[PDB]
A paper describes a structure:
Tetracyclines inhibit protein synthesis by binding at the A site of the small ribosomal subunit and blocking the accommodation of an incoming aminoacyl-transfer RNA (aa-[name]) into the A site of the bacterial 70S ribosome. More specifically, tetracyclines bind at the decoding center (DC) between the head and the shoulder of the 30S subunit, in a pocket formed by helices 31 (h31) and 34 (h34) of the [name] (rRNA). In this work, we determined two (2.8-Å and 3.0-Å) X-ray crystal structures of sarecycline bound to the initiation complex of the bacterial 70S ribosome and found that this antibiotic inhibits bacterial ribosome in part using a mechanism of direct [name] contact, which has not been reported for any other tetracyclines so far. SAR is chemically distinguishable from other tetracycline antibiotics by the 7-[[methoxy(methyl)amino]methyl] group attached at the C7 position of the ring D.
Author numbering:
A (entry chain 17): 1 to 48
B (entry chain 1D): 2 to 276
The structure:
RNA sequence: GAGCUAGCCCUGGCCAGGGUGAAGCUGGGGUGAGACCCAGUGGAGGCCCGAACCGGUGGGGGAUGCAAACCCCUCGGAUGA
RNA sequence: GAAUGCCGGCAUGAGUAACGAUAAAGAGGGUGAGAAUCCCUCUCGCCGUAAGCCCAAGGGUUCCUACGCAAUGGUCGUCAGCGUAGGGUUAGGCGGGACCUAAGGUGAAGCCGAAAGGCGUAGCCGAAGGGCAGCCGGUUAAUAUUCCGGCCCUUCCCGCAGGUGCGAUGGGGGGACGCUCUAGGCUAGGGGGACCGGAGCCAUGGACGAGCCCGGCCAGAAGCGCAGGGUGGGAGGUAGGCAAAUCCGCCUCCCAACAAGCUCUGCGUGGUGGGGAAGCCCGGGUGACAACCCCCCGAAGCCAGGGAGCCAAGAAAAGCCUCUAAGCACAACCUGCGGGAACCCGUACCGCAAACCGACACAGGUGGGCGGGUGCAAGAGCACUCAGGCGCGCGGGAGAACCCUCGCCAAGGAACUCUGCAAGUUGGCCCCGUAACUUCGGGAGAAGGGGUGCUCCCUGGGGUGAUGAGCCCCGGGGAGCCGCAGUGAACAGGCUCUGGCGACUGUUUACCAAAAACACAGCUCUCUGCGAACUCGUAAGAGGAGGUAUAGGGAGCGACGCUUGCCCGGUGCCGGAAGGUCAAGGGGAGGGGUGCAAGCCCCGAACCGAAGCCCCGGUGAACGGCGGCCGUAACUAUAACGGUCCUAAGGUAGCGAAAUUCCUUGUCGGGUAAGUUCCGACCUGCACGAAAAGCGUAACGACCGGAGCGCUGUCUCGGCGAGGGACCCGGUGAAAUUGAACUGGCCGUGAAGAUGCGGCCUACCCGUGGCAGGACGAAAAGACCCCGUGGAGCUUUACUGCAGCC
RNA sequence: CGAUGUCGGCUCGUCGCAUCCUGGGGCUGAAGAAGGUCCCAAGGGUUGGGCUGUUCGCCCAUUAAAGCGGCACGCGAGCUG
RNA sequence: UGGGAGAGGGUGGUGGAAUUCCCGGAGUAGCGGUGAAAUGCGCAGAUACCGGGAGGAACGCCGAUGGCGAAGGCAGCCACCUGGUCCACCCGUGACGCUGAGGCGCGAAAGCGUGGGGAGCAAACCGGAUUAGAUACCCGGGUAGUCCACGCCCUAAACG
RNA sequence: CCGAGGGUAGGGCCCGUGACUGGGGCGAAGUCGUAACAAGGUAGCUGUACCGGAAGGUGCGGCUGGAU
RNA sequence: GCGGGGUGGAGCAGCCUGGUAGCUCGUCGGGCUCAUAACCCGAAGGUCGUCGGUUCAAAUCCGGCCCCCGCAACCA
């Protein structure tokens, strides 16, 4: 049937993207936490 | 005279449509339209705050003229009579001898061709605006301001009116459509005449779709829900109200009064509504 | 977290073919004028039949499945909420 | 040594199920160590509104070639979407930027919020919408509207020519719009041709023929031609479009008014540039100097911003034209020509799928465009078929049971069963015909019946053309023909009588319920006078609504017909300046602590003091409620009438063993051979009842009853046949589960149902295909029940707060 | 209770005998024919249908007769639901 | 042709008395009702009296035994549209007439549908009394309706 | 070809007949009340509406076929 | 199982709080009446379901048997 993951590059960048994070106070922490864990990629790889 | 259909489908039996007769212009005045943000019933927070609203028909906002004291003295001719989807009544296009073009709500009796004015010196004739302190007693008027120069806020729907019952200082006694006898400032502009399109209430929507055409989504009763959603929810089988009937939010809906008691307005209300 | 789902908003797109024949209109019958009757036209509708498409009635299959809801036969809606 | 322990390793089930559509295969010839599985040929099969082709999203090198074959490939593998390497994406015109706006987002100003932040007009961002300038062919192993060829066009800068009051983020016009129906003319696209070209062919009895087979066009600036869209001209006045205005708007006189003209588009022509089949020879070469013509059909596409009708009344801004202001008028703008300048990103390949979403090369899901031919009433249905693509990445056998899917059946025909579940019947079109009832629309495809192919003969109108031929489109009458059968195959209703429930089309528990539930037009109550009520929010601010009582909210019922009775004591709600209680506060009679006192300090009665509760009245389409005993009529029986106690008042109309009736298969009638169901009546209604509405009601229903006709493999009662599995061979190879096992019947015994204990009986060792009685078989720490001073959802006149409101 | 699936039907049965039938007897208020009643006997047999989910029951038409029980109220890794 | 009467009809107007209510004065111990009463209202300020206001329906005297219309029926006053009568002159036409199954039209009240309106009155209804009872007659309330428009209904002791 | 008539299907009229249900008629001396005839103790009758155990009652309008 | 209950002929107060049994209808006697109803004046009639206990004394308080109304009888 129609499954849950229906990919969309504009959506993926505009929701979990770096910019969508650096505006909300919560989003910044998420980056901060991912910079503390040494996460190689602070946000998903959106091809744009 | 409303217009009926023959029962050639199950829903045509009772459906009635306006006879549209007094309409003369079959397209609006491009000069005088602006877009209309269809809210669907949601506020800036995006939360719904009025229920069962949306997915209607698209529509442009015919700008309307609720001051008329804008231009005191300048007459104007009745150009056309037009179909507004934004209100119950009909709109009339006026061509001012000023060259200016404006829309007003069409009173009953207005015919395409006549000239109308606005001001202290106006004839007591349908279509004309005057401050209330200058309209005769017991003359039925409409499009009544509420405060001096604040805009026409009263009697703007199909077949409404308002007689002028008395005079008392800088205030006139107004039988509002509801029946509420109220003080209104004499310096409030009003338009002599009853609003036209009186045959509105006799329109029979006829079928559920036509409701939706108006931006009217289905209403669902509390009695049809669960206790989570509504006081009337629950029960095994159908079930009576089982308490004084309530809104989904708790407050009681039968007979419970809600005008704010200490409203400064009260000091000008004379006889709360009838019937 | 609304890239699934549900509602709304904005902007686009889709709906083979066939049947029925509303008001109206024209002419004619009719009358004091009418109401109104007939034929012709016209082509209304959460109208009819039925693909696309949207569904999911009944059955059979399937049941460590082809599939963590699918398959076959049948069945509903299809200018409309 | 156990924790259904944790991690890992290895077993069992087992050479077992399965190897992912029943669209399908066969042989030959190659390559290579190896071939059912790779490449070529030939035959055979399937897709063809697709299983063909072109876009978008997404995927992100999968594209091409060369060399590979460990692993991935459900078998094999020389092959590949796999490994290695090198190659491959070319734009001023196609898409998106340096253009515009939409919902929304953001946000100088301004507002708000403990901080974080929340709003917000202008503005800015934000497209699959507007706007804007490239069409045909060849080339590459792979890119092409991108390269080349041909013919065109766009904008910026600079000069030159002519003209013009030039000039804008400012005014105005325009851009600019719905749904259905639809004209005229074209094109796309098709069908045919006795015509034009074409390498050829004469079989197997006939045919050298107006025979067969193949093809007969593509683009194009200027000019014209055809068909359409758009568009009135002059003057004077002028307070309006927030300055200005010659523009627009408004009023007036003038002519012109189907038109015509100016202007724009589409189609045709058109310099010119291209293509070009079968068939044969080893993607190419010829054919070929290819021809390139005519008639017909014909768009849903194009002229377009066309027309008409309708009601639900159908985006914005920009480019663009116009008007002016500051300015400047050496300028500036316009029209024409010439040169010069024209950037960043995308471009490979998959793309209804083996490359996207589904853990997989997964029978699932995924928007847009083209989708040919013949026949079938039409069509995108159906069968077949071109082009193009396939034969679904295990096969070879066998011809058991059994299972799936399918075919047929004597006599019977629902006797099957909870139920005709299922499966039969019926089927398209044409004409004949067609009941109760009805809201007059309908019921209705009612029901039922006749017709259907082909040959020949005569004749009716229509489109095109020309009024004729030819092509084409609907028809009519008569005379014959063959078969069991002419919608000869495929696609395509079984019907009737009668109940309940819901008016109806609709909606719903994604993944066990589509219904009688939800909704619904419609009826009633009620709130709300606008800074509305109400809703979200701490607020600001929004919705409501740029609405205004013919409106907006809340609630109940639920088309429509006829109706909706009595109770206001309790509960809510509504009205009530008196009365009573009342909190802080007012007040301070009178007391107290203290100090030499002046003082400082505390307690503190009456009396004044909100709403709220009490008190009074109203209110049922507000929450809600609608009795008991006893007696009485020229027979029995039953009580119209009475007696009496109780209530706030005692069930009215209508309906009733019902979606409600317990006793109950109540009794009576209908139907049936037989009827706990069904229909129709009765009424001692356990326990209907009047807007959580009552009694009906045409039409409607994949809803639930009951009867009947037709026809049936449902059944008596089963038989045979087909294919895909099951079975044997080759290849590959899981799974739950599993204390260990050397795992029999009985009758007994045991924690009460023994392969395992006792006694008896029986029994050589091991498999294979089969059946499911047992192993209290598997699966899941019972979902019922209790237990826990375990949880959570839900209610309320449970308790205690809080928001909100007074 | 770290699961023994509950009624009824279908299919296949099998055992008990407290015998529905058929076979053999005594007694009879056994004339005959036909019964009532007890005794022996489990070998075989024990129908089709209407109603209801039904077991059961009633009912129609037959019959030699239309027996009654147990086997986890036999039987869902056999079906039905 | 000229002349007269008349509530004949249709629409648009509009005047005053009175009933009801609302607001204000003033004022108090009752009002109201009947056969006599009670229910009801009133010290939460009634009734009775004065001013202002809201609205509806019906038109005192004239008015009579009257006039008018085919019937049903029609009454304050003003205006517009309009029907049938009657008088006079003997002007015009020249039997053109009488009737009337059918048909069509009008048709008090009540009643019905869709809306408005609603003062007074009042089926149903509630209460107080009477009564053996009183589902009545009388009194206190009171809903449709009575009224305007539109569409049905078509009955009568529609009678002289 | 037609055709007695046989059969299939659907219609119209009429007669019988039916659980039960509606009133009607009659029935020597049944129960309730007392509506009408006297102003029948509220004058009656009427069309119509609603209501009540029943006769009746009330409302709106109409008739005198009503008395002093 | 839990709750209420039985009293002149009919139907009901009195029970809780012991001593007194009461209201209406009817039955009877007499009145008005031509007569019946109504209506008026009088009078009768109750050992309080039953047996036992408490008490000085029981319709009244308790217990047992009888009989009548009402509610409950659920989960699988
Ligand atoms: K339970
Ligand atoms: Mg989905
Ligand atoms: Mg889908
Ligand atoms: Mg996933
Ligand atoms: Mg995207
Ligand atoms: Mg998106
Ligand atoms: Mg982002
Ligand atoms: Mg965000
Ligand atoms: Mg922060
Ligand atoms: Mg790194
Ligand atoms: Mg992140
Ligand atoms: Mg009108
Ligand atoms: Mg009609
Ligand atoms: Mg209209
Ligand atoms: Mg605009
Ligand atoms: Mg809005
Ligand atoms: Mg916002
Ligand atoms: Mg709301
Ligand atoms: Mg909403
Ligand atoms: Mg309007
Ligand atoms: Mg409105
Ligand atoms: Mg005012
Ligand atoms: Mg109207
Ligand atoms: Mg309405
Ligand atoms: Mg709308
Ligand atoms: Mg609604
Ligand atoms: Mg609803
Ligand atoms: Mg529910
Ligand atoms: Mg609640
Ligand atoms: Mg409830
Ligand atoms: Mg419920
Ligand atoms: Mg429910
Ligand atoms: Mg219930
Ligand atoms: Mg409540
Ligand atoms: Mg509130
Ligand atoms: Mg969504
Ligand atoms: Mg998505
Ligand atoms: Mg659209
Ligand atoms: Mg469609
Ligand atoms: Mg069509
Ligand atoms: Mg027609
Ligand atoms: Mg027309
Ligand atoms: Mg339809
Ligand atoms: Mg299904
Ligand atoms: Mg089926
Ligand atoms: Mg299975
Ligand atoms: Mg499953
Ligand atoms: Mg399927
Ligand atoms: Mg539909
Ligand atoms: Mg739509
Ligand atoms: Mg241990
Ligand atoms: Mg384990
Ligand atoms: Mg563990
Ligand atoms: Mg582990
Ligand atoms: Mg390891
Ligand atoms: Mg291992
Ligand atoms: Mg092995
Ligand atoms: Mg083996
Ligand atoms: Mg095995
Ligand atoms: Mg498989
Ligand atoms: Mg598999
Ligand atoms: Mg298939
Ligand atoms: Mg396939
Ligand atoms: Mg198959
Ligand atoms: Mg196929
Ligand atoms: Mg070799
Ligand atoms: Mg090999
Ligand atoms: Mg091979
Ligand atoms: Mg082979
Ligand atoms: Mg193969
Ligand atoms: Mg190959
Ligand atoms: Mg095809
Ligand atoms: Mg996208
Ligand atoms: Mg390999
Ligand atoms: Mg190998
Ligand atoms: Mg290697
Ligand atoms: Mg592999
Ligand atoms: Mg695989
Ligand atoms: Mg091999
Ligand atoms: Mg290999
Ligand atoms: Mg090799
Ligand atoms: Mg490449
Ligand atoms: Mg630049
Ligand atoms: Mg922009
Ligand atoms: Mg942004
Ligand atoms: Mg764009
Ligand atoms: Mg472009
Ligand atoms: Mg081009
Ligand atoms: Mg110029
Ligand atoms: Mg400009
Ligand atoms: Mg527009
Ligand atoms: Mg558009
Ligand atoms: Mg073309
Ligand atoms: Mg063709
Ligand atoms: Mg030969
Ligand atoms: Mg060309
Ligand atoms: Mg001007
Ligand atoms: Mg090649
Ligand atoms: Mg299209
Ligand atoms: Mg148009
Ligand atoms: Mg429309
Ligand atoms: Mg805008
Ligand atoms: Mg100069
Ligand atoms: Mg640049
Ligand atoms: Mg490319
Ligand atoms: Mg597909
Ligand atoms: Mg596609
Ligand atoms: Mg592929
Ligand atoms: Mg999956
Ligand atoms: Mg994996
Ligand atoms: Mg595969
Ligand atoms: Mg083709
Ligand atoms: Mg054809
Ligand atoms: Mg066809
Ligand atoms: Mg195959
Ligand atoms: Mg075999
Ligand atoms: Mg057979
Ligand atoms: Mg038969
Ligand atoms: Mg049957
Ligand atoms: Mg059977
Ligand atoms: Mg049945
Ligand atoms: Mg079936
Ligand atoms: Mg019939
Ligand atoms: Mg008929
Ligand atoms: Mg009949
Ligand atoms: Mg049809
Ligand atoms: Mg038929
Ligand atoms: Mg037909
Ligand atoms: Mg024939
Ligand atoms: Mg033939
Ligand atoms: Mg078929
Ligand atoms: Mg059909
Ligand atoms: Mg329905
Ligand atoms: Mg209905
Ligand atoms: Mg639902
Ligand atoms: Mg479900
Ligand atoms: Mg669920
Ligand atoms: Mg689920
Ligand atoms: Mg689910
Ligand atoms: Mg359901
Ligand atoms: Mg359905
Ligand atoms: Mg519903
Ligand atoms: Mg409905
Ligand atoms: Mg209704
Ligand atoms: Mg707004
Ligand atoms: Mg409304
Ligand atoms: Mg509402
Ligand atoms: Mg409805
Ligand atoms: Mg409902
Ligand atoms: Mg009450
Ligand atoms: Mg009350
Ligand atoms: Mg009360
Ligand atoms: Mg009620
Ligand atoms: Mg209750
Ligand atoms: Mg109560
Ligand atoms: Mg008797
Ligand atoms: Mg009644
Ligand atoms: Mg009954
Ligand atoms: Mg029963
Ligand atoms: Mg029954
Ligand atoms: Mg019933
Ligand atoms: Mg019941
Ligand atoms: Mg029963
Ligand atoms: Mg029976
Ligand atoms: Mg009975
Ligand atoms: Mg009920
Ligand atoms: Mg209710
Ligand atoms: Mg109910
Ligand atoms: Mg109710
Ligand atoms: Mg009817
Ligand atoms: Mg019906
Ligand atoms: Mg019905
Ligand atoms: Mg259904
Ligand atoms: Mg049933
Ligand atoms: Mg049958
Ligand atoms: Mg069979
Ligand atoms: Mg056989
Ligand atoms: Mg086979
Ligand atoms: Mg062998
Ligand atoms: Mg392998
Ligand atoms: Mg061992
Ligand atoms: Mg034992
Ligand atoms: Mg044992
Ligand atoms: Mg043993
Ligand atoms: Mg042992
Ligand atoms: Mg042993
Ligand atoms: Mg031992
Ligand atoms: Mg043995
Ligand atoms: Mg085996
Ligand atoms: Mg077993
Ligand atoms: Mg087992
Ligand atoms: Mg287990
Ligand atoms: Mg489980
Ligand atoms: Mg556990
Ligand atoms: Mg447990
Ligand atoms: Mg506890
Ligand atoms: Mg405990
Ligand atoms: Mg607890
Ligand atoms: Mg939970
Ligand atoms: Mg708080
Ligand atoms: Mg257990
Ligand atoms: Mg159980
Ligand atoms: Mg004998
Ligand atoms: Mg049993
Ligand atoms: Mg039984
Ligand atoms: Mg015998
Ligand atoms: Mg068991
Ligand atoms: Mg068992
Ligand atoms: Mg048992
Ligand atoms: Mg048992
Ligand atoms: Mg078993
Ligand atoms: Mg089972
Ligand atoms: Mg079972
Ligand atoms: Mg008297
Ligand atoms: Mg008093
Ligand atoms: Mg006082
Ligand atoms: Mg009033
Ligand atoms: Mg003369
Ligand atoms: Mg003469
Ligand atoms: Mg009337
Ligand atoms: Mg009448
Ligand atoms: Mg008379
Ligand atoms: Mg015969
Ligand atoms: Mg009498
Ligand atoms: Mg009397
Ligand atoms: Mg009288
Ligand atoms: Mg009387
Ligand atoms: Mg009465
Ligand atoms: Mg007591
Ligand atoms: Mg005492
Ligand atoms: Mg006494
Ligand atoms: Mg004693
Ligand atoms: Mg329970």
């Amino acid at each position: 049937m129609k499954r849950t993951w229906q990919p969309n590059r504009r959506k993926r960048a505009k929701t979990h993207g770096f910019r969508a994070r650096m505006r909300t106070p919560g989003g910044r922490k998420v980056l901060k936490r991912r910079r503390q864990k040494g996460r190689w990629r602070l946000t998903p790889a959106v091809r744009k | 005279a409303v217009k009926k259909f023959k029962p050639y489908t199950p829903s045509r039996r009772f459906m009635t449509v306006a006879d549209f007769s007094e309409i003369t212009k079959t397209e609006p005045e491009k000069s005088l339209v602006k877009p209309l943000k269809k809210t669907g019933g949601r506020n800036n927070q995006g939360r719904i705050t009025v229920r069962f609203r949306g997915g209607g028909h698209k529509r442009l906002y015919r700008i309307i003229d609720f001051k008329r004291w804008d231009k005191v003295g300048i007459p104007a001719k009745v150009a056309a009579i037009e179909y507004d989807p934004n209100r119950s009544a009909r709109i009339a296009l006026l061509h001012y001898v000023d060259g200016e073009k404006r829309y007003i709500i069409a009173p009953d009796g207005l015919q395409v061709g006549q000239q109308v004015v606005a001001g202290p010196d106006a004839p007591i004739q349908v279509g004309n605006a005057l401050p209330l302190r200058f309209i005769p007693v017991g003359t039925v008027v409409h499009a009544v301001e509420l405060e001096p120069k604040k805009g026409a806020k009263l009697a703007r729907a199909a077949g409404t009116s308002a007689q002028i019952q008395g005079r008392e200082g800088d205030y006139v006694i107004l039988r509002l459509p509801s029946g509420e006898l109220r003080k209104v400032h004499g310096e409030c502009y009003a338009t002599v005449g009853a609003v036209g399109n009186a045959d509105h209430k006799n329109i029979v929507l006829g079928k559920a779709g036509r409701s939706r055409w108006l931006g009217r989504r289905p209403h669902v009763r509390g009695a049809a829900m669960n206790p989570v959603d509504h006081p009337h929810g629950g029960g095994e089988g159908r079930a009576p109200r089982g308490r004084p009937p309530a809104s989904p939010w708790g407050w009681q809906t039968k007979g419970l009064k809600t005008r704010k008691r200490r409203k400064p307005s009260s000091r000008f209300i004379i006889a709360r509504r009838k019937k």
